[PDB]
């Protein structure tokens, strides 16, 4: 019978079967990586990260399950799973007085999905989720390729009391242009700007980027903090938020000791 066969195929390493089954059995796993506030944000900010386990409990490479997801047309549905579970956890936390906020990725498929907003509206209401508890994170490349969808989407999220962010910012031709049309409070700059910081020029480039962002009234998020050296440099440069294994890596628990007033 069908269930027996799906299960058999998944056991065989057919990642498409693994994905189809995981949506129906919670065989995904959410991880959370703290976003650290340098400028006095009270919120407990976490980025959510998705992992997939195969039936034998081992993790399947994201690159491979991402690939299989596009091919089986499963991307929008995966985002929904993450969004739904993110909403659930966030309701339970906020109810226990935790000021927690989650950054959630949207794939380009979801970016182009007219059904997202309507469905989202009811997922939020069903959980009676507090205002501005969710930040949707869209990669620069995607928001750029589909600027029309991105403007519309971010307008909708606004109306829903949701925030938004662009990640991997600053690699396009004119990064700051796409910002004109979009409704985003957060800009998460690409980790390539955090490479070779010893070089004074990279230092200036970073500082200038962060400066332009604060000019456009954006909150800057700088990732890939792997050392004290880089943490200090980012603080000096005036980054509003930072993230990195050095602060804390991804964890299945939201147990981070945020300290920001």
TrEMBL record:
3',3'-c-di-GMP binds at residues 33, 50-51, 79, 168, 224, 226, 245. Mg(2+) 1 binds at residue 14. Residues 12-261 form the EAL domain. Mg(2+) 2 binds at residue 47. This is FimX. The lineage of its organism: Bacteria, Pseudomonadati, Pseudomonadota, Gammaproteobacteria, Pseudomonadales. The gene is fimX.
């Amino acid at each position: 019978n069908p269930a027996e066969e799906l299960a058999a195929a998944a056991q065989r390493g057919d990642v498409i079967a693994i994905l189809q089954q995981a949506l129906e059995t919670n065989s995904f796993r959410l991880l959370f990586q703290p976003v650290i506030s340098l400028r006095g944000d009270s919120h407990e900010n976490y980025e959510v990260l998705l992992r997939l386990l195969n039936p034998q409990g081992q993790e399947v490479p994201p690159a491979e399950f991402l690939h299989a997801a596009k091919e089986a047309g499963l991307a929008e549905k995966i985002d929904r799973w993450v969004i739904l579970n993110s909403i659930k956890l966030l309701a339970e936390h906020r109810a226990k007085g935790h000021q927690t906020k989650l950054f959630v990725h949207l794939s380009s498929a979801s970016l182009q999905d007219p059904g997202l907003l309507p469905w989202l509206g009811v997922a939020l209401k069903a959980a009676r989720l507090p205002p501005e508890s969710l930040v949707f994170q869209i990669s620069e490349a995607d928001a750029t390729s589909y600027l029309k969808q991105a403007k519309q989407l971010t307008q909708g999220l606004a109306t829903l009391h949701c925030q938004a962010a662009i990640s991997q910012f600053g690699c396009s031709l004119n990064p700051f242009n796409a910002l004109k049309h979009l409704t985003v409070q957060f800009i998460k700059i690409d980790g390539s700007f955090v490479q070779d910081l010893n070089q004074v020029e990279n230092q200036e480039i970073l500082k200038g980027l962060i400066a332009e962002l604060h000019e456009q009234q954006k909150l800057s998020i700088v990732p890939f903090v792997e050392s004290a050296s880089v943490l200090a440099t980012l603080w000096q440069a005036g980054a509003t938020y930072i993230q990195g294994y050095y602060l804390q890596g991804p964890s299945q628990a939201m147990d981070y000791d945020f300290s920001s007033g």
